[PDB]
Amino acid sequence: ARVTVQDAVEKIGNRFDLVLVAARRARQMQVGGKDPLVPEENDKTTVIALREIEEGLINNQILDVRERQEQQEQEAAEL
């Protein structure tokens, strides 16, 4: 039941790419088998991703490096 976004906006100043990165992270949670990092309490994926972004453990570069690690794991399983 998050009411504000300002605290999460302070992490990503533009507040326009904040929507994009949070949507990407929430899509990762709800479509894939990915489990949230910040503990969940009967909350929608929207607020879960927003709370992760607030804590500073989620960013566009962090998501990019995580995707690179998953790509390396996927190519490793091939051989």
Partner 1 sequence: MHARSTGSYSLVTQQPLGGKAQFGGQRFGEMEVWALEAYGAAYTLQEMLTVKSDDVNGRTKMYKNIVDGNHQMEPGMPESFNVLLKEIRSLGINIELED
Partner 2 sequence: EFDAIKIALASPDMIRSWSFGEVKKPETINYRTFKPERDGLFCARIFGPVKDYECLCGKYKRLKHRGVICEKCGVEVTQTKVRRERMGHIELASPTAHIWFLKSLPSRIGLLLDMPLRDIERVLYFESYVVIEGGMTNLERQQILTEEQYLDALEEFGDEFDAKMGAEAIQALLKSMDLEQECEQLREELNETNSETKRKKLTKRIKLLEAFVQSGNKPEWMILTVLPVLPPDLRPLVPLDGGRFATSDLNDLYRRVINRNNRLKRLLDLAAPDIIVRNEKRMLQEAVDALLDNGRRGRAITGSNKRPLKSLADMIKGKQGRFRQNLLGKRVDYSGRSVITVGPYLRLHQCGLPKKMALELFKPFIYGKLELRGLATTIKAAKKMVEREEAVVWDILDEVIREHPVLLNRAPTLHRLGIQAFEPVLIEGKAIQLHPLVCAAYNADFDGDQMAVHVPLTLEAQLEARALMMSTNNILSPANGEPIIVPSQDVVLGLYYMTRDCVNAKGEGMVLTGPKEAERLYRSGLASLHARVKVRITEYEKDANGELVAKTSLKDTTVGRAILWMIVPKGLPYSIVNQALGKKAISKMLNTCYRILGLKPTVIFADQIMYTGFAYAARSGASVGIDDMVIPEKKHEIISEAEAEVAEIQEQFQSGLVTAGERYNKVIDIWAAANDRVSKAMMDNLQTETVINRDGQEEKQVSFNSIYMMADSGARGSAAQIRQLAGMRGLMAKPDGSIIETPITANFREGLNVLQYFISTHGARKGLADTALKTANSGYLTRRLVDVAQDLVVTEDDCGTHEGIMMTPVIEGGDVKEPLRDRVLGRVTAEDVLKPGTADILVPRNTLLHEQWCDLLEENSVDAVKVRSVVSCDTDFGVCAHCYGRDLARGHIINKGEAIGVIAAQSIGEPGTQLTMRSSIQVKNKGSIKLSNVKSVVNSSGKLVITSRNTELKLIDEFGRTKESYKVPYGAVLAKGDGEQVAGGETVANWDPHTMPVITEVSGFVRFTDMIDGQTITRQTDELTGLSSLVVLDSAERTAGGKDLRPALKIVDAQGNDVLIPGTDMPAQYFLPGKAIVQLEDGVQISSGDTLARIPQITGGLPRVADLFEARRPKEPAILAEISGIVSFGKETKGKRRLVITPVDGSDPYEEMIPKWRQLNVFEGERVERGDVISDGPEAPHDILRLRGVHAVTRYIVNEVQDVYRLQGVKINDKHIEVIVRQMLRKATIVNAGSSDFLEGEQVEYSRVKIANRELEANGKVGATYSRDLLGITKASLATESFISAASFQETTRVLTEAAVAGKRDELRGLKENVIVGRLIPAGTGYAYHQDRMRRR
**Chain positions contacting partner 1, by CB under 8 A:** 16, 19, 23, 27, 30-31
Shortest separation between residue 66's beta carbon and partner 2, angstroms: 19
Shortest separation between residue 45's beta carbon and partner 1, angstroms: 9
40: left (phi over 0), alpha (psi -120 to 50) or beta: beta
> Segment contacting partner 2 (CB under 8 A): 21-29, 33-41, 61-69, 70-78?
21-29
Task: Please name the residue ranges forming H helices in the chain.
Answer: 6-9, 17-31, 45-55, 60-78
In the window 35-64, what residues touch partner 2 (CB under 8 A)?
42-47, 49-50
* Separation CA 4–CA 6 (nearest Å): 6
